[PDB]
């Protein structure tokens, strides 16, 4: 009946002064816009149908046309920025926010979805949705004693749209909006649905992707132990944003980093640093590099958790971008650690895989590695053991690399090499 109408027929029905004819044509537009292969969003926009869809959002006495136009506008808003802007330009934001309080759950849910697409376009539309007042009625939909009484799909859509209000960074969402959203986010982070959990972690990862004061707003809410638990989940869609949130937090202060350690996060890293998904391994190793950039007592916790052998492992074999994070983790370690912690690094076998990576063409990973060797040599000078390290570097073919890096396009790489040759290989 409403399957595969031409746009011309849709316009004809929507432009009739017959509400039932408009309903039929609107549903036909919805089905057109619902197909997978190239829905004709632009043809629908060019026919001038968005203002009519938006006015149908307000037809309280015909809830079916509210639903059909909400769905049609949702799918237009799901397209390019220009296509989303056309929905916004038609006045859809206040009309969708008014539908959040609809007694029809399926209409309210569709308005949640539509605002998620609009907010998800970028910071400006996100903040415009916030200025029109979306947050209060969105949160009111989740003000229930037990989240489990809400329909699963409804709860997932609410969580996803909330995460888009937490997303994007130039600028970050308004501080007061984040403060307003966070207690509901914390409650969603303890829900048992894996999709709600994944999108809740994503939202937290966005909020911690910023300056230390942004991290602190999240960390003060006590979520770190729950993030560490989710870090151990078997669902990769949960581990990935949980790890990104944890990695964001350890870019903050040493005190914020300590809350991650206190929560037991380091005990998960044997798995994460050998995880078969290469980007988990990379994110986990980046996280390690920001922990080894901390206090000596935090470096010591890395040691105690047996994580240095795992760093030797990723340095020895891993995709190259993970090995770069591992090199950073080692140089950070050698820059802040004690003599004993640096000596322990050599005893674990850091020298040979570190020398092997000097063959890379990445100029900055060589600067990073050269810095680490200089730091390890400085620890060796305090124990009179500079030679024993020189023989070890030369026995694994390292000396050949540093003496060959005496011919590099980068000036600082050349000079760091010859200084190591000058001072420890005479």
């Amino acid at each position: 009946g409403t399957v595969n109408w031409s746009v011309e027929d849709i316009v004809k029905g929507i432009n009739s002064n017959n509400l039932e004819s408009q309903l039929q044509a609107t549903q036909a537009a919805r089905k057109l816009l619902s197909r997978e292969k190239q829905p004709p969003i632009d043809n629908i926009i060019r026919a001038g149908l968005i203002p009519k869809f938006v006015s149908f959002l307000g037809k309280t006495d015909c809830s079916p046309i509210q639903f059909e136009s909400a769905w049609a506008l949702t799918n237009i808003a799901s397209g390019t920025s220009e296509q989303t802007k056309a929905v916004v330009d038609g006045g859809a934001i206040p009309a969708f926010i008014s539908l959040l309080a609809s007694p029809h759950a399926h209409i309210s849910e569709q308005a949640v979805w539509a605002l998620g697409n609009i907010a998800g376009d970028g910071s400006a539309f996100r903040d415009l949705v916030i200025k029109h007042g979306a947050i209060d009625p969105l949160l009111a939909l989740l003000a229930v004693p037990d989240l489990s009484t809400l329909a699963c799909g409804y709860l997932r859509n609410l969580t996803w749209t909330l995460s888009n209000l937490c997303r994007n960074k130039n600028p970050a969402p308004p501080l007061d909006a984040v403060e307003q959203i966070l207690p509901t986010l914390v409650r969603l982070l303890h829900h048992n649905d894996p999709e709600v959990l994944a999108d809740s972690c994503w939202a937290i990862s966005y909020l911690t992707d910023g300056p230390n004061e942004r991290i602190e707003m999240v960390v003060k809410k006590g979520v770190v132990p729950q993030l560490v638990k989710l870090l151990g989940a078997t669902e990769l869609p949960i581990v990935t944003p949980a790890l990104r949130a944890i990695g964001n937090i350890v870019t903050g202060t040493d005190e914020q980093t300590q809350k991650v350690i206190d929560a037991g996060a380091l005990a998960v890293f044997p798995s994460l640093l050998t995880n078969p998904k290469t980007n988990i391994q990379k994110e986990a190793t980046w996280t390690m590099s920001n922990i080894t950039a901390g206090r000596q007592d935090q470096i010591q916790q890395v040691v105690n958790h047996g994580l240095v052998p795992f760093l030797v492992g990723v340095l020895s074999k891993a995709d190259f971008k993970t090995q770069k994070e591992a090199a950073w983790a080692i140089t950070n370690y050698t820059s802040g650690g004690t003599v004993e912690q640096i000596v322990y690094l050599v005893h674990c076998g850091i020298i040979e895989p570190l020398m092997n990576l000097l063959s890379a063409k990445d100029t900055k990973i060589i600067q990073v590695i050269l810095d680490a060797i200089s730091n390890i040599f400085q620890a060796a000078e305090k124990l009179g053991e500079t030679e024993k390290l020189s023989i070890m570097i030369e026995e694994c073919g390292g000396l050949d690399k540093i003496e060959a890096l005496q011919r590099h396009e980068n000036e600082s790489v050349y000079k760091a090499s010859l200084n190591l040759i000058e001072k420890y290989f005479s």
Partner: peptide
């Protein structure tokens, strides 16, 4: 992140 926007096909 996961998708910025979501299309509803049903």
């Amino acid at each position: 992140s996961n998708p910025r926007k979501k299309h509803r096909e049903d």
